[PDB]
Amino acid sequence: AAYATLITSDAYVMGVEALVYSLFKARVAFPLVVLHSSQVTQPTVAKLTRFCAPFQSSTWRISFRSVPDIGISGYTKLHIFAMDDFEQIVYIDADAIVLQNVDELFDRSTSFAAAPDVFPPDRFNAGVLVIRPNKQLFADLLAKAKELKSYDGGDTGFLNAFFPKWFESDAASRLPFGYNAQRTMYWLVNGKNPGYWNAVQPLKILHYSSNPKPWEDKGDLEILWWQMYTESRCMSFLG
């Protein structure tokens, strides 16, 4: 079993670094695979590898894997379904950070789990996925990628069209929102109804969905991201 993340542009390297360090800080008991697509330049890969080196130990491995871009690079994330050298993958977007150990996600008996999106709340968000790789399912995703329209023009819309009965699936396949707590809800509710956000307990993964990404541009959640990132740079370079 492994955690996996994805980088398809040099500009997201700071997101990966914050995520890597948040997993290190949470003492996760499974290795991490960083997928990087063709558009990520080799110097950025080398920089990322150097940043991760001080977090490597005999008890935690961070590995790197080249993957081809999957165009609509908008579908490159589908590569997690082909990683069948692993029985189970916990995939996390590079614009998320882990606040608490989430190793229990590997205890879910399902081939596919995701957390609900906020709009609408009976569809799922594709930023956190717990999957069991299967190369035949991967092939059919690739094939259907040229047929199924996506209501958000991205991988979330496409995956919901491919798994339209996710909402009806068992509890193992539907992650609580605390495993993919999207800052878009915080932005909307914090000023008037902050109690809606405080209801999300435990809050284990923060997802910095929508734009700009925190490294691209001072809300409370963005302060938290920079706290994680700057500590990561401090510990990687000085620790």
Ligand X SMILES: O=c1ccn([C@@H]2O[C@H](COP(=O)(O)OP(=O)(O)O)[C@@H](O)[C@H]2O)c(=O)[nH]1
Region for 35 from its dihedrals, namely left if φ exceeds 0, alpha if ψ lies in -120 to 50, beta otherwise: beta
95 binds ligand X (CB under 6 A): yes
- Please identify which residue in 17, 93, 117, 155 interacts with Mn ion, judged by CB under 5 A: 93
Query: Is 17 or 93 the residue whose CB approaches Mn ion more closely?
Result: 93
Site string for its own copies, 162-201 (x = CB under 8 A): -----xxx-x--x-xx-------x--xx---x-xxxxxx-
Q: What is the DSSP letter of 117?
A: P
Separation CA 1–CA 88 (nearest Å): 5
Beta strand pairing call for 89-92 and 62-66:
unpaired
Does the footprint of Mn ion cover residue 117 (CB under 5 A)?
Answer: no
Amino acid at 3: Y
Using CA of residue 120, residue 74, residue 223, residue 201, what is the dihedral sign? positive
Residue 94 binds which of its own copies, Mn ion, ligand X, none (CB < 5-8 A, kind-dependent): ligand X
Site for ligand X in 23-82 (CB under 6 A): none
Whether 105 contacts 54, CB under 8 Å:
no
Q: Binding mask 49-88 vs Mn ion (x if CB under 5 A, - otherwise)? A: ----------------------------------------
- Give the Cα separation of 48 and 75 in Å (integer): 22
Q: At residue 23, what is the residue type?
A: L
Residue 109 site contact among ligand X, Mn ion, its own copies, none (CB < 5 to 8 Å, cut-off depends on kind) = none
| Binding to ligand X, residues 172-211 (CB under 6 A) | 209-210
